[PDB]
Design a protein around this nucleic acid. Structure first.
Lengths: 163, 56, 147, 103, 83, 128
RNA sequence: AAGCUUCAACGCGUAAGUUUGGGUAGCGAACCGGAUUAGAGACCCGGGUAGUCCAAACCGUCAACACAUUAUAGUAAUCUAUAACGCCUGGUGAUACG
């Protein structure tokens, strides 16, 4: 009985979800690496940042009036953009490998965003005073298809839960 | 004087009435303890919890 | 002859090419870099965006298409999603297979040993390349040994 | 995360129901996969200041401590457990580290 | 970091050998002992990371009299870091 | 508002070369023997920290009579606390840890400690 | 090297002010009352409404100052080489248009 109490202590059930998400964060570092314990290759970086922006975007439809680490949310999004746009130039097979495993589009840069020879399907958006989350939400929805899927899923969920 | 265990987190009356609490329901400030100032601030926090507590 | 990056291929039998040409200004003794855009004929549409191409003057084909594509030097590698999933399969197969064959020797020890001996085999190889190129000599300079 | 609760209790009731009140809080933390480490009271201490602006209960109040390991989901039921009962006045719930360095 | 031992006076102090320097502490005759501060005086970066300047060598002579006494540091691909 | 600079031999030199007048008489002194003017700046505050501080802090915490030797400052013979700390340190670099060295230093230098406490009790009976 | 800067764009933004909802310990514009003085509209004594309080939005300007741009390289700079910047060009005249 007392060993059962010890294993229910040492479980991840009891922890605060800061520590729970940190333990599954080194689970993800065990997943995405090229290697036994590589923690600084750029695939590790973008895996951490993509997962991080997913639990923070859940937290940030939950809390809207937060303002201090929303700067940090921008810092993750911009440094992730820097990391993909570097890694495409640097090691392309790792680039394609990661944004297939995570399932992300291409975000590289009177210009074209490196489309093919033929079949030049395109996606460009240019305008012809906002608050924060009313603009930071649809960008982060826009580049990432998993977040768009979560958006349409929770939209259908609320529309059939109110009905 | 700076024995950490039983003084660092502990809100009970004895240590604070000995060396941390002014007599008129008030506290002993930084100059009257001669203790490391961050540790003093955290135990001053503990004492000032204990002035919100049912004790003191 | 220009060697400059493509930027547009949305365009029939014609690619828009940008070249970094540097103009002098006399006032400040500073070379200012501008980039001009040219329209150039290609024939095979093998130019994906990001390719480094060689354009040359030929007979004009239009009002503003004036060069012709000679050769694409460095190919721009492109995102194929199914091939990317194939690299996912091969890459985690390689990682799991290496960890299973390895897994006391914690796997870092075995891989770092393999990287040490791989670097040693490399250093022996380029050292013997230097040995066949030069002979027994101090690595002072190759400019000294060019005599 | 183990949670101390140096909470107050009504001063001189017959103990037939304050023990039942702790049975209720023990039932509340009994749920959600966690349990009390030690239930250490301090008997009774007369207080330092009066409380209950409505009904004027007074000092001489009773003291209890729970020391329970709980996942964070159980706190909102514990908030109801400490909020609905008018036999208790104040409750202080503190996190404690995994070295089990409790009060 | 790379610690330059600056030449304070009008002699190098080879018997000092201020850290690294010329091997062997023997000049022939000992010299004056001047108290001058540090002889690289008012060094001017005349190339400049925005504007590189080629000075075709007669222009280099005619701008050498524009500035006070001292030696240009120059680059050339066949010769490296030159005067 | 000018600036302090080189001194006296660059200041004599550009006069003395031309045959202005004869020198101040110590020119042979000024030339044959190397100087240094205080070329005054801060290359870095060299606060080179003593290794004997933790050993002397512990020994002065444990035996405070080691604050009370008479000691000749101007002869470089070491005092008793220094042989304490040097004995502990030479047992440290011998390979043992700190506390076993402190115990061996307690055994191997206590004799002068009871000699000193006898001397201090004699001075105590002298003063009172 | 994925670094530096930010033209452009875009957010943060003390406090006032406005729209919406109410009601409100203390704080303190109006409105009436009295005072140094000849008139007194102010300082000061005297009650005290919006607003200060809350929740949502708009505004975004200022001795918002290290008046010390940002960053790197040197031992917390106003010792100063550079990288991208932003701003000034005698004073009075910046308000009016768009």
């Amino acid at each position: 009985s007392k060993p059962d109490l010890v294993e229910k202590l040492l479980s991840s059930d009891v922890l605060g979800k800061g520590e729970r998400r940190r333990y599954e964060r080194q689970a993800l570092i065990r997943e995405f690496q090229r290697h036994p314990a590589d923690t600084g290759s750029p695939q590790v970086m973008v895996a951490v940042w993509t997962h991080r922006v997913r639990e923070l975007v859940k937290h940030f439809d939950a809390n809207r009036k937060e303002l201090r680490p929303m700067r940090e949310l921008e810092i993750m999004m911009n440094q992730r953009r820097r990391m993909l746009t570097w890694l495409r130039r640097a090691d392309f097979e790792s680039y394609a490998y990661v944004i297939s495993k995570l399932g992300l589009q291409d975000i590289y840069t009177x210009x074209x965003x490196x489309x093919x020879x033929x079949x030049x399907x395109x996606x460009x958006x240019x305008x012809x005073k906002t608050n924060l989350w009313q603009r930071l939400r649809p960008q982060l929805l826009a580049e990432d298809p998993v977040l768009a899927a979560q958006a349409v899923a929770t939209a259908a969920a609320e529309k059939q839960r109110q009905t | 004087v700076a024995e950490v265990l039983e003084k660092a987190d502990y809100k009970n009356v004895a240590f604070l009435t000995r060396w941390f609490l002014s007599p008129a329901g008030r506290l002993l400030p930084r100059r009257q303890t001669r203790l490391p100032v961050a540790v003093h601030k955290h135990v001053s926090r503990q004492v000032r919890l204990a002035r919100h507590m049912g004790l003191i | 002859e220009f060697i400059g990056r493509v930027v547009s291929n949305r365009m029939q039998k014609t690619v828009v090419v940008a070249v970094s040409y540097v103009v002098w200004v006399p006032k400040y003794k500073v070379y200012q870099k501008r980039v001009a855009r040219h329209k150039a004929r290609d024939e095979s549409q093998a130019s994906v965006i990001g390719d480094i191409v060689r354009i040359r003057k030929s007979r004009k084909f239009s009002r503003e298409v004036s060069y012709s594509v000679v050769d694409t030097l460095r190919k721009a590698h492109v995102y194929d999603p199914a091939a990317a999933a194939a690299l996912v399969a091969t890459r985690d197969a390689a990682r799991a297979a290496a960890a299973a064959s390895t897994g006391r020797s914690d796997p870092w020890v075995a891989e770092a040993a393999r990287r040490l001996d791989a670097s040693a085999a490399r250093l022996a190889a380029l050292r013997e390349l230097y040995e066949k190129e030069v002979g027994p000599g101090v690595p002072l300079s190759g400019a000294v040994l060019a005599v | 995360p183990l949670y101390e609760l140096l909470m107050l209790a009504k001063p001189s009731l017959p103990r037939a129901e304050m023990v039942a009140l702790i049975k209720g809080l023990g039932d509340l933390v009994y749920r959600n996969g966690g349990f009390v480490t030690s239930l250490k009271s301090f008997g009774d201490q007369h207080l330092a200041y009066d409380l209950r602006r409505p009904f004027e209960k007074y000092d001489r109040a009773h003291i209890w401590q729970m020391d329970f390991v709980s996942s964070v989901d159980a706190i909102k039921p514990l908030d109801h457990g400490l909020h609905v009962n008018n036999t208790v006045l104040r409750w202080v719930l503190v996190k404690r580290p995994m070295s089990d360095k409790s009060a | 970091l790379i610690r330059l031992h600056l030449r304070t006076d009008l002699f190098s102090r080879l018997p000092g050998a201020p850290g690294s320097g010329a091997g062997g502490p023997q000049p022939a005759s000992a010299q004056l002992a001047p108290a001058v501060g540090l002889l690289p005086l008012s060094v001017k970066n005349i190339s400049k990371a925005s504007q590189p300047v080629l000075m075709y060598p007669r222009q280099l002579e005619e701008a050498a009299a524009r500035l006070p006494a001292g030696v240009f540091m120059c680059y050339h691909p066949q010769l490296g870091l030159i005067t | 508002r000018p600036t302090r600079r080189a001194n006296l031999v660059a200041k004599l030199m550009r006069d003395l070369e031309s045959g202005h007048f004869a020198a101040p008489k110590a020119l042979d002194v000024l030339t044959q023997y190397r100087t240094e003017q205080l070329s005054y700046s801060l290359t870095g505050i060299p606060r080179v920290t003593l290794p004997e501080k933790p050993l002397i802090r512990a020994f002065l915490q444990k035996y405070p009579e080691a604050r009370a030797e008479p000691v000749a400052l101007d002869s470089f013979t070491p005092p008793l606390a220094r042989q304490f700390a040097q004995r502990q340190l030479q047992l440290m670099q011998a390979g043992a840890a700190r506390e076993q060295a402190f115990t061996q230093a307690e055994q191997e230098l206590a004799g002068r400690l009871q000699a000193l406490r006898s001397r201090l009790l004699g001075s105590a009976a002298t003063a009172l």
